[PDB]
Amino acid sequence: TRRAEVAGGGFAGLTAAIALKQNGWDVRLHEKSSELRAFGAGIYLWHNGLRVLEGLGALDDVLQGSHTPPTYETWMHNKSVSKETFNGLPWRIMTRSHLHDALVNRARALGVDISVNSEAVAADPVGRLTLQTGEVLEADLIVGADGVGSKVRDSIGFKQDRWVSKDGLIRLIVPRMKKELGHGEWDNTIDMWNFWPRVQRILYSPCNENELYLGLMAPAADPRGSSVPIDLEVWVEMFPFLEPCLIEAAKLKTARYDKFETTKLDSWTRGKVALVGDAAHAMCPALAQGAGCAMVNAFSLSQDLEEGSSVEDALVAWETRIRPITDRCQALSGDYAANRSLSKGNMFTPAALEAARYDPLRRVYSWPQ
Amino acid sequence: TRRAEVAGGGFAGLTAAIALKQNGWDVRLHEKSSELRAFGAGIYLWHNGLRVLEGLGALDDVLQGSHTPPTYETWMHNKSVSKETFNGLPWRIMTRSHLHDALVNRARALGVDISVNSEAVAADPVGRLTLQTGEVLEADLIVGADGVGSKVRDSIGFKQDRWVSKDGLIRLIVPRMKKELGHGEWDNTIDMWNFWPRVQRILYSPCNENELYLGLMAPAADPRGSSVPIDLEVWVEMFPFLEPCLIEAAKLKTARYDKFETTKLDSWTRGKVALVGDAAHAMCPALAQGAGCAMVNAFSLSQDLEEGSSVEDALVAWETRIRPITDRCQALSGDYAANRSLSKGNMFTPAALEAARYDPLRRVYSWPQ
Amino acid sequence: TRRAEVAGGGFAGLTAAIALKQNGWDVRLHEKSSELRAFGAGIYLWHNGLRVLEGLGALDDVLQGSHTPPTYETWMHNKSVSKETFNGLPWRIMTRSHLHDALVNRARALGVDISVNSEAVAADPVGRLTLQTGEVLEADLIVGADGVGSKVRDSIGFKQDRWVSKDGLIRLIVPRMKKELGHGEWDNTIDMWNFWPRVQRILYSPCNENELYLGLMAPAADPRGSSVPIDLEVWVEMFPFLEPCLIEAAKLKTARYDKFETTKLDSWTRGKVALVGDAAHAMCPALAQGAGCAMVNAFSLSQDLEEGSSVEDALVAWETRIRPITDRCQALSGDYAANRSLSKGNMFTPAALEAARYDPLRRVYSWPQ
Amino acid sequence: TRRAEVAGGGFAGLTAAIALKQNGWDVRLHEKSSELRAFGAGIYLWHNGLRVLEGLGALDDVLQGSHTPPTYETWMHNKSVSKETFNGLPWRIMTRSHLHDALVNRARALGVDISVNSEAVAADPVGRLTLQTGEVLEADLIVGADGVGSKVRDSIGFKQDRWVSKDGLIRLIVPRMKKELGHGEWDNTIDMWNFWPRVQRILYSPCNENELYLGLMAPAADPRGSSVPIDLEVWVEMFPFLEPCLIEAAKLKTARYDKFETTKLDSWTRGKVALVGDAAHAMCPALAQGAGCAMVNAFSLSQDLEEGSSVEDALVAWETRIRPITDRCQALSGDYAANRSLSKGNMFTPAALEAARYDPLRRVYSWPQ
Numbered sequence A, B, C, D: 001t002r003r004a005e006v007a008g009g010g011f012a013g014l015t016a017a018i019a020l021k022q023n024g025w026d027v028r029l030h031e032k033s034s035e036l037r038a039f040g041a042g043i044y045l046w047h048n049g050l051r052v053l054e055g056l057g058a059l060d061d062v063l064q065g066s067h068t069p070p071t072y073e074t075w076m077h078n079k080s081v082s083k084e085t086f087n088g089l090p091w092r093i094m095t096r097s098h099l100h101d102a103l104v105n106r107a108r109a110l111g112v113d114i115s116v117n118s119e120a121v122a123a124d125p126v127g128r129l130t131l132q133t134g135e136v137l138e139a140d141l142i143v144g145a146d147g148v149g150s151k152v153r154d155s156i157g158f159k160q161d162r163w164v165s166k167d168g169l170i171r172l173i174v175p176r177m178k179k180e181l182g183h184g185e186w187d188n189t190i191d192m193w194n195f196w197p198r199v200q201r202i203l204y205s206p207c208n209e210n211e212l213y214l215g216l217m218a219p220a221a222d223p224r225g226s227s228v229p230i231d232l233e234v235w236v237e238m239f240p241f242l243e244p245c246l247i248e249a250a251k252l253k254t255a256r257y258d259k260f261e262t263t264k265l266d267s268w269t270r271g272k273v274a275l276v277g278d279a280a281h282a283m284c285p286a287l288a289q290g291a292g293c294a295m296v297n298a299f300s301l302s303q304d305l306e307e308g309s310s311v312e313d314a315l316v317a318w319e320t321r322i323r324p325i326t327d328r329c330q331a332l333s334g335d336y337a338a339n340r341s342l343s344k345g346n347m348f349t350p351a352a353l354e355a356a357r358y359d360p361l362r363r364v365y366s367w368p369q
């Protein structure tokens, strides 16, 4: 029986672990945290990611208790400039813990071995995984799914571009307050941009009837706009119509201002070691394909290993087949983010939705635009 | 190697033929008419039907050149009373010929044997099918997919319950005429109801950028409102905003008329004989689930034939499994037609969508409401 | 010093009394009832009537505590079909008691002699007025301003044309209830028409921040729709959006009902006798010009009495001058009532507003359309 | 017979001349231009100014061929932030030449003597007017109505604040293009403000069915925004929806960028000399009361001279009675303009409309807010 060691219990690792376990691999997953959790309040998935969940036998638990807005709306200075529905392309908004719980339960149900407080600090391409405790594990496959600061990656050395954005945002979950919001289209996704009187933006994303996901974006050199817990006045000033929710947000002390880190590698594989997710391809958040591409790539990895070839050859086949979708998506996402292209609305072009349109299960592009 | 005779080349018949063929059946399809064609109208499919198409390998041909409206809108006396998007549950509008062509080509590529000009007139519960020429064809399974006037079930004697509505409607296709329509949300499904000055309803359905599907509903007891070619005046009178399109519609010397009609049977199976589509369960078009349930039931038929039983025991287990869903859908659809409930808007409740939520491939309900 | 007896303390009577008084007439006013009061409804005045009020020195008391709606809106089956603002032509809504109180106080300040509990029963074309007590009062001018059942003209015998509508309506006042009404443009005049399920119309008229004037129209042949106190169900059924206000309206054990009624006379003058207001020209309330034409005609009466003629020659020159305007307005108003034309919206055409455009002070038409 | 010499044939002088002539003054008006014309494309008048026209016997010719928008709307970054109707307060938009022609025709009809190419260069308080030609005129009254650079004022010496604004605007008349503008509320007044991506603003004011008045405002140090003829690209960029009209505006070569000059004086009178209009009180354009206050003041001057006192004493009475309305209005207007207070909408407060509410004919405040 083939043995897999997965480093990282985020979406990438849990996806890889479940996918491999379903193919009869024996699999242990290492999470360095004392407990399995997800961070970042909310998340969008699209058709591509939802297809992975389906292939993971975890779709049902994700749809139940999540939400598809009637429309994806963009505002500039409180003026609606676009409403997009993507010609029926499936998409979904949920809390990070909602998507995460579904993945964990599915992994435990298949009998994936999960070690918490277990941190990968080095990996050898001949299939050896070194933990912080000193323990050394032999395996036929080693998946580095350990985030943007991947120690699996850096222990081996991968030529790479790695940098951090100037600005970031505060992501949080607050009650919907839908009756308090009064008249309007409050089940929509609404990207509310402003450049006057200053640069402040909210991405309003309903997760379900109870929970609203908010991304509060202001420049890092805005001492008030970037404060956590949120400086209520400067947010209520530019978003009066979101006051009830902003009030609940001011109450939260777990709130943080996060900047965005990206990584581009020349290669995602070295012998028996594969890098998936942010370890290999962290990107600007603009197209909300960060975890989708991670899940697709993780899922596609288990597929390429069902071909009868050596683990080394499958991995090279894997990357060659799957990476260009992620490359174009990261490039376009970076371009959008640095140009603030989303603020114009109607940005979800056919090209922008390429990653979203990919079906990992049948390996084709679906939902044409 | 099991052998199957399928009577009628409609959606239910083609679905049945392809599904069996994919499972290794030798299948032959008899089409009464001189060729394979559809009524020249539009049609709605939902998640349940789309999943069947995925299961038959015909999803991609369909999605290409079809449209998901941004919303499903209901009007009452030109006042918007409802916008619905079904919490993300997939759906689609397309011409009937579009759906047909995809099923036909998939049927052909797989090597189904399609006999045109060939009319089934009788079937035996021991496994025989009689054509209009009196010729007797043997097989291990006979599929009555011959529509509402099904000779195959009439030849055997099935106790039908029948029910007819006061309403009928005209289904046709015209150019989108989108500029001439001027200002509005003309990519929507708009269900335009009126009770004053008289009962007249137009279902407005965009199929793609070139073709608009119109459903013109009126009491059958209305000489003008049910007239094909269409009585241009009575329609423009109550729907002035659709004038350009209606002008192209009174130009059609031939167009499909139907009186709403719902038939429920004591059973669907007699020995080696199975009834699918309108033959088994024709319903009132309120919930746009006729072809949907047909396809689900035709596809589900080949599923139960795989579990290693006699064709007879399988057909019984089939109906026992898949039927209640069709029954509940037919009942609710007929109730809506009678009380004209769709004029109220917001009528696609969780109960109304139970059919559409059902996933035939995995045999669960998805897309919770 | 000429001397005048005016019968009836309505708008036409008060206008007449004040106008003559300002010109040096000694004037006495007889009010049948125990005191001076108005029906407890609302009322529309236009430029023509406002100019009369300016001419009587009573404009300012009126404008204070009255409202000009931002627009005059027409609905059909809850669909907005019309917004009108009359190219700036002035207009106003106010309670009837508001208009009354201003005229009364102006009448008093000028020293008009107001006799209450005093009922005119007959008048002589030689200059005599008979009270219910049989007492005969002499004067140089008698003014029949005693309303629709005018004893003063009946005593003399005027050939009337009469005409009655199938419709009547309930006029009442309730609190504005503006928060409870929620989202909308609730300072508008909204004329809410319905023909389905049955003919029911509500004229929605804000008078000021505290008081809302409602006109509930229904066929007189409708037992429920014409019932005062109001049949709460039938109204909330067709007007759910006005529920809070209607709740306060079914709380009124007494409220003004009127069947539409239009009377045209062979003439308005007999010798020294002049007829004004409903006495002379009661009309269908479609164009809200009854009190308007009354006041214009009462005010115009004192104008012709100044040009140095016999009271008899003056009264003749008066009608010859001012009457056609009232005739055209009465005809068009009656036509609108009969055909229920106001349901179509945009019905305040140039012709429909000829009355309102007329300026009594300068004797020209203003505010062209 | 009293003789008046009026310097200046703008709205102030023509108003004074007509008013005085109507009171039996003999009056000559001096206009330094070779021909009588008005400049500045369009103009707003309100109730106060319309009341003066009424008192001048020139109201009728102004209403005919002018326009009252349904509403006064304000936009910020294409988002409607206010719609104001001023509780029925009359107001009107017209071309400058429309208001001017009415005044000229009325002045000629009364027999006002009009000398063109006649420029006042000095005035003596004992009633002497010196022209550029050398001619010296004796009179009982001398009205300085000669604009912001009043030579009547400066020949005598009046302590004063006089300055020029930093920015200005381009005012022009173009065809309505109402069909080309497509869907919207294109009979409204719309003040369209923007500060991002740059400071550009259009005041959109319909004058009648044929003529639209546009004020294109950009800073003086914007080389493109301030160009005449207009730089079409930078205007179409921020106002795409006004393209058809902007195209017609680019065509005009008479277009100029004008800055705003103001004057505040300690006194408006010296002996027999009175200053009216911009000569005495030019103000920031924000409240559109520039010509209204001029007309009110001019008209009020003829009133104070019908009191039987000396011309010197009437003039002191005149200013004392009438000036504070103009003072508060100019101060508020200046405050608004420098603060760009109009951009917030809902700025036409009761206080802002004080000047507008004044009725010069009855000397009271009307149309309460």
Ligand SMILES: Cc1cc2nc3c(=O)[nH]c(=O)nc-3n(C[C@H](O)[C@H](O)[C@H](O)COP(=O)(O)OP(=O)(O)OC[C@H]3O[C@@H](n4cnc5c(N)ncnc54)[C@H](O)[C@@H]3O)c2cc1C
Binding pocket: A007, A008, A009, A010, A011, A012, A013, A030, A031, A032, A033, A037, A040, A042, A043, A044, A045, A118, A119, A120, A121, A145, A146, A147, A148, A150, A151, A152, A169, A171, A259, A260, A261, A276, A277, A278, A279, A282, A283, A285, A288, A289, A290, A291, A292, A293, A294
């Ligand atoms: C602001 C923002 C908004 C975003 N919105 C979306 C969105 O809407 N939709 C979307 O699809 N994507 C979105 N993304 C991107 C998405 O969050 C990431 O692409 C995704 O979380 C990557 O998951 P991962 O499992 O590869 O990495 P991670 O989530 O970083 O997970 C790795 C897990 O690694 C564990 N671990 C770390 N180091 C070790 C180690 N050395 N040994 C063992 N375990 C280790 C980490 O602690 C954690 O448990 C967004 C990103 C940002 C920044």
Ligand SMILES: Cc1cc2nc3c(=O)[nH]c(=O)nc-3n(C[C@H](O)[C@H](O)[C@H](O)COP(=O)(O)OP(=O)(O)OC[C@H]3O[C@@H](n4cnc5c(N)ncnc54)[C@H](O)[C@@H]3O)c2cc1C
Binding pocket: B007, B008, B009, B010, B011, B012, B013, B030, B031, B032, B033, B042, B043, B044, B045, B118, B119, B120, B121, B145, B146, B147, B148, B150, B151, B152, B169, B171, B258, B276, B277, B278, B279, B282, B283, B285, B288, B289, B290, B291, B292, B293, B294
């Ligand atoms: C007005 C109206 C609107 C509708 N809208 C929708 C909608 O939006 N969505 C939806 O899912 N459903 C809709 N339906 C219902 C849907 O059209 C039917 O349920 C569906 O077409 C049934 O297909 P079928 O193949 O069973 O029957 P049919 O389409 O009637 O096809 C049978 C085929 O039978 C062949 N055949 C018949 N008899 C013989 C024979 N004796 N021998 C050999 N061949 C024979 C027929 O000629 C034809 O080729 C609607 C129905 C109506 C009436």
Ligand SMILES: Cc1cc2nc3c(=O)[nH]c(=O)nc-3n(C[C@H](O)[C@H](O)[C@H](O)COP(=O)(O)OP(=O)(O)OC[C@H]3O[C@@H](n4cnc5c(N)ncnc54)[C@H](O)[C@@H]3O)c2cc1C
Binding pocket: C007, C008, C009, C010, C011, C012, C013, C030, C031, C032, C033, C042, C043, C044, C045, C118, C119, C120, C121, C145, C146, C147, C148, C150, C151, C152, C169, C171, C258, C276, C277, C278, C279, C282, C283, C285, C288, C289, C290, C291, C292, C293, C294
């Ligand atoms: C439903 C409805 C809605 C209307 N809405 C409007 C509107 O919006 N705007 C508008 O301008 N018009 C409106 N009108 C019409 C308007 O109400 C009348 O034209 C107006 O009230 C007529 O006033 P009047 O003074 O002539 O008569 P009345 O108001 O009838 O007054 C006469 C006065 O007559 C006294 N009197 C009567 N008989 C005698 C007597 N014999 N002896 C002594 N005193 C007597 C009466 O008691 C009372 O004091 C409406 C009318 C109706 C029916």
Ligand SMILES: Cc1cc2nc3c(=O)[nH]c(=O)nc-3n(C[C@H](O)[C@H](O)[C@H](O)COP(=O)(O)OP(=O)(O)OC[C@H]3O[C@@H](n4cnc5c(N)ncnc54)[C@H](O)[C@@H]3O)c2cc1C
Binding pocket: D007, D008, D009, D010, D011, D012, D013, D030, D031, D032, D033, D037, D040, D042, D043, D044, D045, D118, D119, D120, D121, D145, D146, D147, D148, D150, D151, D152, D169, D171, D259, D260, D261, D276, D277, D278, D279, D282, D283, D285, D288, D289, D290, D291, D292, D293, D294
């Ligand atoms: C951009 C802008 C927009 C405005 N919008 C409005 C508005 O919407 N509504 C409003 O009410 N006001 C408005 N105003 C203000 C309004 O234009 C002025 O207040 C008004 O034109 C003043 O008129 P006047 O007759 O006093 O002066 P002027 O119009 O300057 O007229 C004097 C006349 O003086 C003649 N003349 C000059 N010198 C002599 C001389 N020495 N001897 C003899 N004749 C002489 C001038 O040539 C001309 O014929 C606006 C002003 C600006 C700048």
Ligand SMILES: O=C(O)c1cncc(O)c1
Binding pocket: A042, A043, A044, A169, A203, A215, A285, A286, A287, A288
């Ligand atoms: O920060 C963003 O631009 C962003 C854009 N889309 C989804 C999301 O979760 C975040």
Ligand SMILES: O=C(O)c1cncc(O)c1
Binding pocket: D042, D043, D044, D169, D203, D215, D285, D286, D287, D288
């Ligand atoms: O420039 C202005 O602010 C202006 C404001 N109101 C009316 C007008 O004609 C101009």
